[PDB]
Amino acid sequence: AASNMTASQITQEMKIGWNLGNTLDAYGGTAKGVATETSWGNPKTTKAMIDAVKAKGFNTVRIPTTWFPHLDGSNNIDSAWMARVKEVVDYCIDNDMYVILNLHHEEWVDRPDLGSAYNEMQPKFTKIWSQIADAFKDYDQHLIFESMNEPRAKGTDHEWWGPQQSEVDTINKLNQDFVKLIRSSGSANNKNRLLMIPGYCASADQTMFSKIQVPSDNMVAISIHAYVPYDFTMNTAVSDHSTFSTKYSSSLNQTLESIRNTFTSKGIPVVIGEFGTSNFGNTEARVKWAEQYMRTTKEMGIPCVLWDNNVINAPSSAGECHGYLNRSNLTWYTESEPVVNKMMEVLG
């Protein structure tokens, strides 16, 4: 039997990741059951799609999963939904890849009353994680659990900046509950599993990530979303995205160095679980952004997980064109493939 890997060994082997976006995270339609998977316009996921992700050079898949539509009144997870999640996990694990499984667009997490909601949330949160930990109890350390996605006071004047202390407290307490629960599982795989925990809104700004309470656990990583700098990567209020100018290079460097200062220079593992740029017909600028981003994070030892929602064109939402793999025909979208190629070049 192989012995257990450390957090540092795991983050090194993860290398670079790919998110199965707008898929098991989709919600809100008239679709019920496993049919939620296709409700935002993507095809049913196949192993051939994951095979193509591995072939391009990725070694991690994040599977964002929205669970609340698949719960009964007692918070039991529908058995056909759990089986489908496991089927998709296996497409990746069977390819010798790492997998990150989370709770994603939960309407009982992303909520304006987050700062008062701990006692309502705690029993539901623990019952859900207990079921996931048991369903995957015999999976080795290639499988990583992530407590929550972007917990925040949704709809308020502080959804993305400047949280209340009550909201910081709710998130910190639930993260401690999660780590304690996983380590109390009877499975040795769960006792040794790498776990990821976010701060308020998964922020990449030090004012918020410096308020994260780090559990006293040597197999935990901090998760950050870093679509930075936002005015370049996605902001549709900014007209021109054609150039990765010096000011944007300065902004990116400042953000990444703040993560090194708070976390990695102090021995705390970090995973950037979502990053990316939208396709504004600005491929060369996105390539220059990717070269700097990957050169910096490679030296910091931070694995980065690209957001891929299979959308290459969206005239009414031009900031959400995050497609790289054309899932229908197993080719890579021509406008965005050079961005991935630069990432693999740097990491080689």
Extract the tokens encoding 36.
């939620």
CB 64 within 8 A of CB 109: no
Extract the tokens encoding 4.
């257990």
Beta strands 143-146 and 17-20 are unpaired
CB 88 within 8 A of CB 43: no
Q: Is the peptide bond before 229 cis (omega within 30 degrees of 0)?
A: yes
Catalytic residue, from 37, 106, 146, 150: name it. Answer: 150
∠ at Cα 224 (223, 228), nearest 5°?
160
Q: Exposed, middle or buried by CB within 10 Å (0-12, 13-18, 19+), for 204?
A: buried
CB 136 within 8 A of CB 100: no
Extract the tokens encoding 345.
């070049």
The size of the chain, in residues, is: 348
∠ at Cα 64 (59, 70), nearest 5°?
140
| Cα 255 from chain centre | 18
3-state secondary structure of 37: helix
CB 219 within 8 A of CB 180: no
Does residue 150 carry a catalytic annotation?
Answer: yes
Domain range annotation of the chain: 1-348
Cβ neighbours around 315 below 10 Å, total: 6
Extract the tokens encoding 68.
């609340």
Question: Which residues have C-beta within 8 Å of that of residue 143, sequence separation ≥ 6?
Answer: 89, 93, 98, 99, 101, 136, 193
Which residues does a chain break follow in the chain (C to N more than 2.5 Å)? none
Rounded Cα distance between 28 and 21, Å, is 15
What's the per-residue H, E or C state across 109-142?
CCCCCHHHCHHHHHHHHHHHHHHHHHHCCCCCCC
Rounded Cα distance between 256 and 111, Å, is 29
Catalytic residue, from 274, 284, 320, 335: name it. Answer: 274
Residues facing residue 196 across a β-bridge = 146, 221
DSSP 203-231: --SHHHHTT----S-TTEEEEEE---SHH
Q: Between helices 47-56 and 79-93, what is the axis angle to 10°?
A: 30
CB 45 within 8 A of CB 88: yes
CB 44 within 8 A of CB 38: yes
Extract the tokens encoding 280.
């504004």
∠ at Cα 77 (202, 89), nearest 5°?
65
